[PDB]
Amino acid sequence: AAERIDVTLPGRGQLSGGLHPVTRTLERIEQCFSRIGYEVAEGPEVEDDYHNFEALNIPGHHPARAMHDTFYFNANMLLRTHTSPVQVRTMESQQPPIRIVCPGRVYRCDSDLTHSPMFHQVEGLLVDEGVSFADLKGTIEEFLRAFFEKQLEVRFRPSFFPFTEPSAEVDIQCQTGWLEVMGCGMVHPNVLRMSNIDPEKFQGFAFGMGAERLAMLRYGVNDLRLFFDNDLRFLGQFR
Amino acid sequence: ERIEQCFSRIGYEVAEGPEVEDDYHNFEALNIPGHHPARAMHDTFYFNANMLLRTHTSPVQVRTMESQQPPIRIVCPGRVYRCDSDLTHSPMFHQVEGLLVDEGVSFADLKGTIEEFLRAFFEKQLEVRFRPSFFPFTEPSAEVDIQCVICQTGWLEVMGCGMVHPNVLRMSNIDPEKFQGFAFGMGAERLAMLRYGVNDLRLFFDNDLRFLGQFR
Amino acid sequence: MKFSEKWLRSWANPQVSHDELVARLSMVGLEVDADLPVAGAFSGVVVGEVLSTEQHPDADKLRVCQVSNGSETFQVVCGAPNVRAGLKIPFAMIGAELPDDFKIKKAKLRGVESFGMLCSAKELQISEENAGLLELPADAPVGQDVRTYLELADYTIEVGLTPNRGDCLSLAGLAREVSAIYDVPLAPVAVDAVAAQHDETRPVELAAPAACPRYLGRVIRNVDLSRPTPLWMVERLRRSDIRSIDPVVDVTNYVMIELGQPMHAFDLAEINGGVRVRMAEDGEKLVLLDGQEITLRADTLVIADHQRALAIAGVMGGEHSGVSDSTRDLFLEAAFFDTIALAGKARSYGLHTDSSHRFERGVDSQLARKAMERATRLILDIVGGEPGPIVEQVSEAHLPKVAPITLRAERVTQMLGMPLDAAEIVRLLQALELTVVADGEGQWSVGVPSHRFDISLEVDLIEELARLYGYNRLPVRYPQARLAPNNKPEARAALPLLRRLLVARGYQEAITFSFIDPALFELFDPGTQPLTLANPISADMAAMRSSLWPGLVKALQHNLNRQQSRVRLFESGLRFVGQLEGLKQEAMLAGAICGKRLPEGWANGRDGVDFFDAKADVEAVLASAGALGDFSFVPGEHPALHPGQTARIEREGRLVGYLGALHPELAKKLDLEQPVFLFELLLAEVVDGHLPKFRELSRFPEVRRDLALLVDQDVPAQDILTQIRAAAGEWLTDLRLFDVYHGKGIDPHRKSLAVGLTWQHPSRTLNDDEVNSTTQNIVTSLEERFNATLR
Amino acid sequence: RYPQARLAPNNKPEARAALPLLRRLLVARGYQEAITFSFIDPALFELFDPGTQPLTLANPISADMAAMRSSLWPGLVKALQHNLNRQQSRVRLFESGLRFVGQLEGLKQEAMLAGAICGKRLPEGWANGRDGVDFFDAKADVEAVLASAGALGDFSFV
Ligand SMILES: O=C(Nc1cccc(S(=O)(=O)N2CCN(c3ccccn3)CC2)c1)Nc1nccs1
Ligand SMILES: O=C(Nc1cccc(S(=O)(=O)N2CCN(c3ccccn3)CC2)c1)Nc1nccs1
- Same domain as C776, residue C724: yes
Indicate whether D62 belongs to any domain.
Answer: yes
A123 CA to centre of ligand 1 in angstroms: 8
Partners of residue B106 in chain C, C-beta under 8 Å = 414-417, 477
Cβ contact (<8 Å) for D14 and B112?
no
Considering C475, C507, C532, which residue would you say is the last residue of a domain?
C475
Does C454 appear as a known binding residue?
Answer: yes
Pick the CATH number of B1-216 from 3.50.50.60, 3.30.465.10, 3.30.930.10, 3.65.10.10: 3.30.930.10
Collapsing DSSP states into helix, strand and coil, what is residue C310? strand
C731 CA to centre of ligand 2 in angstroms: 63
Domain of C322: which CATH number? 3.50.40.10
Instruction: For chain C, list the contacting chains (3+ Cβ pairs, <8 Å).
Output: A, B, D
- CA distances from residue D39 to B140, C11, C461, D45 in whole angstroms, order as listed: 63, 86, 71, 10
Sign of the Cα torsion C653, C654, C657, C661 reads positive
Buried b (16+ CB within 10 A) or exposed e, C459-484: bbbbbbbbbbbebeebebbbbebebb
Is the separation of the CB atoms in C521 and C545 below 8 Å? yes
Helical segments of A79-223, H only:
84-93, 133-147, 189-194, 211-219
Cβ contact (<8 Å) for B112 and D8?
yes
Query: Does B87 touch chain C if contact means CB atoms closer than 8 Å?
Result: no
Indicate whether D54 belongs to any domain.
Answer: yes
CA–CA dist A166, A184 (Å, integer): 9
Check residue C313 and report its DSSP letter. T
CA–CA dist C393, C303 (Å, integer): 14
Among candidates C398, C314, C297, C302, which has minimal Cα distance to C349? C297
Beta strands in chain D (DSSP E): 4-6, 32-33, 39-40, 55-56, 67-68, 91-101, 108-118
Strand pairing partners for C516?
C543
Peptide bond into C643 cis (omega under 30): no
Partners of residue D144 in chain A, C-beta under 8 Å = none
Is the separation of the CB atoms in C83 and C118 below 8 Å? yes
CA–CA dist C180, C168 (Å, integer): 13
Closest residue by Cα to atom 13, ligand 2, is B160
Q: What is the resolution of this structure in A?
A: 3.0
Query: Does B9 touch chain D if contact means CB atoms closer than 8 Å?
Result: yes
- Same domain as C384, residue C281: yes
Pairing relation of β-strands C263-267 and C391-394? unpaired
- Same domain as C650, residue C506: yes
- Same domain as C668, residue C536: yes
Check residue C486 and report its DSSP letter. -
Is the separation of the CB atoms in C387 and C471 below 8 Å? no
Map out the domains of chain A with their CATH numbers: 19-239 (3.30.930.10)
Closest residue by Cα to atom 25, ligand 2, is B58
- Same domain as C390, residue C241: yes
Amino acid at C268: L
Strand pairing partners for D32?
A18, D93
CA–CA dist B148, B128 (Å, integer): 11
Dmax (CA) for chain C in angstroms is 139
Closest residue by Cα to atom 16, ligand 1, is A161
State the CB neighbour count (10 A cutoff) for residue C556.
28
CA–CA dist A201, A191 (Å, integer): 14
C661 CA to centre of ligand 1 in angstroms: 60
CA–CA dist C3, D39 (Å, integer): 82
Instruction: For chain D, list the contacting chains (3+ Cβ pairs, <8 Å).
Output: A, B, C
- Same domain as C717, residue C587: no
Domain of C448: which CATH number? 3.30.56.10
State the CB neighbour count (10 A cutoff) for residue B160.
19
Indicate whether C480 belongs to any domain.
Answer: no
Among candidates A4, A139, A149 on the partner chain, residue whose Cβ is nearest the Cβ of C644: A4
Among candidates C495, C419, C409, which has minimal Cα distance to C446? C409
Closest residue by Cα to atom 27, ligand 1, is A84
Considering C647, C666, C690, which residue would you say is the last residue of a domain?
C690
Strand pairing partners for B185?
B97, B160
C146 CA to centre of ligand 2 in angstroms: 50
**Residue D155 CA from chain centroid, whole number:** 19
Is the separation of the CB atoms in B188 and B4 below 8 Å? no
How far off is chain B from D13, nearest CA to CA, in Å? 7
Cβ contact (<8 Å) for B131 and C343?
no
How many domains does the structure of chain D reveal?
1
Which of D2, D6, D10, D145 to mutate: most B Cβ within 10 Å? D10
Check residue D114 and report its DSSP letter. E
Backbone angles phi, psi at C309, to 5 degrees: -70, 140
Check residue A36 and report its DSSP letter. B
Q: How many helices (H) and strands (E) does chain A have?
A: 8, 9
CA–CA dist C39, C90 (Å, integer): 14
Cβ contact (<8 Å) for A142 and D2?
yes
Indicate whether C219 belongs to any domain.
Answer: yes
Closest residue by Cα to atom 17, ligand 2, is B135
**Which of the ligands is closest to the CA of residue A205?**
1
State the CB neighbour count (10 A cutoff) for residue C771.
17
Closest residue by Cα to atom 3, ligand 2, is B184
Among candidates C3, C25, C35, which has minimal Cα distance to C177? C25
**Helical (H) or strand (E) element with C530:** none
Pairing relation of β-strands C543-544 and C285-287? unpaired
Chain A nearest-CA residue for C734: A233
Cβ contact (<8 Å) for B166 and C531?
no
Considering C354, C379, C394, which residue would you say is the last residue of a domain?
C394
Cβ contact (<8 Å) for C512 and B205?
yes
Parent domain of C780 = 699-791
Which residues contact ligand 1 via a Cβ below 6 A?
Answer: A 58, 64, 82, 84, 87-88, 123, 125, 161-164, 182-185, 187, 191, 206-208
Amino acid at C630: D
CA–CA dist D70, D68 (Å, integer): 7
CA–CA dist B188, C367 (Å, integer): 46
Tally the C-alpha atoms within 13 A of residue C396's C-alpha that lie toward its C-beta.
Answer: 0
State the CB neighbour count (10 A cutoff) for residue D19.
10
**Helical (H) or strand (E) element with D6:** strand D4-6
Which of D2, D4, D11, D25 to mutate: most B Cβ within 10 Å? D11
Sign of the Cα torsion C679, C683, C685, C688 reads positive
Q: Is residue C274 exposed (0-12), middle (13-18) or buried (19+ Cβ within 10 Å)?
A: middle
Partners of residue A8 in chain C, C-beta under 8 Å = 633-635, 647, 716-719
Partners of residue B7 in chain D, C-beta under 8 Å = 9
How far off is chain C from B120, nearest CA to CA, in Å? 14
Q: Which residues are within 8 A (CB) of C340 and not within 5 positions of it... i.e. 6 or more apart?
A: none
Among candidates C219, C222, C221, C220, which has minimal Cα distance to C201? C219
Q: Which atom of ligand 2 is nearest to the CA of B95?
A: 11
Check residue D15 and report its DSSP letter. S
Indicate whether D37 belongs to any domain.
Answer: yes
Domain of D116: which CATH number? 3.30.930.10
DSSP labels for A3-19? -----SPPPSS----B-
CA–CA dist C145, C147 (Å, integer): 5
Q: What angle do CA A207, A209, A215 make, to 5 degrees?
A: 155
How far off is chain B from C481, nearest CA to CA, in Å? 9
Chain D nearest-CA residue for A235: D32
- Same domain as C515, residue C627: yes
Cβ contact (<8 Å) for C623 and A16?
yes
Among candidates C38, C146, C141, C140, which has minimal Cα distance to C90? C146
Best residue for ligand 2 mutational test, from B89, B96, B135 (most atoms within 8 Å of Cβ): B135
Backbone angles phi, psi at C731, to 5 degrees: -80, -5
Tally the C-alpha atoms within 13 A of residue A221's C-alpha that lie toward its C-beta.
Answer: 25
DSSP labels for C39-86? S---EEEEEEEEEEEEE-TT-TT-EEEEEE-SS-EEEEEE--TT--TT
Closest residue by Cα to atom 27, ligand 2, is B58
CA–CA dist C526, C548 (Å, integer): 15
Best residue for ligand 1 mutational test, from A53, A54, A84 (most atoms within 8 Å of Cβ): A84
CA–CA dist C482, B70 (Å, integer): 12
- Same domain as C642, residue C493: yes
**Helical (H) or strand (E) element with C243:** none
Among candidates C179, C172, C177, which has minimal Cα distance to C162? C177
Among candidates C168, C286, C264, which has minimal Cα distance to C218? C264
Q: Which atom of ligand 2 is nearest to the CA of B160?
A: 10
CA–CA dist B77, B57 (Å, integer): 7
Check residue D122 and report its DSSP letter. S
Best residue for ligand 1 mutational test, from A82, A120, A137 (most atoms within 8 Å of Cβ): A82
Start-to-end CA span in chain B (Å):
15
Amino acid at C472: N
Indicate whether C189 belongs to any domain.
Answer: no
Pairing relation of β-strands C2-4 and B180-187? unpaired
Chain A nearest-CA residue for C733: A233
Is the separation of the CB atoms in C67 and C116 below 8 Å? yes
Does C784 appear as a known binding residue?
Answer: no
How far off is chain C from A34, nearest CA to CA, in Å? 9
Chain A nearest-CA residue for B7: A35
Indicate whether C191 belongs to any domain.
Answer: no
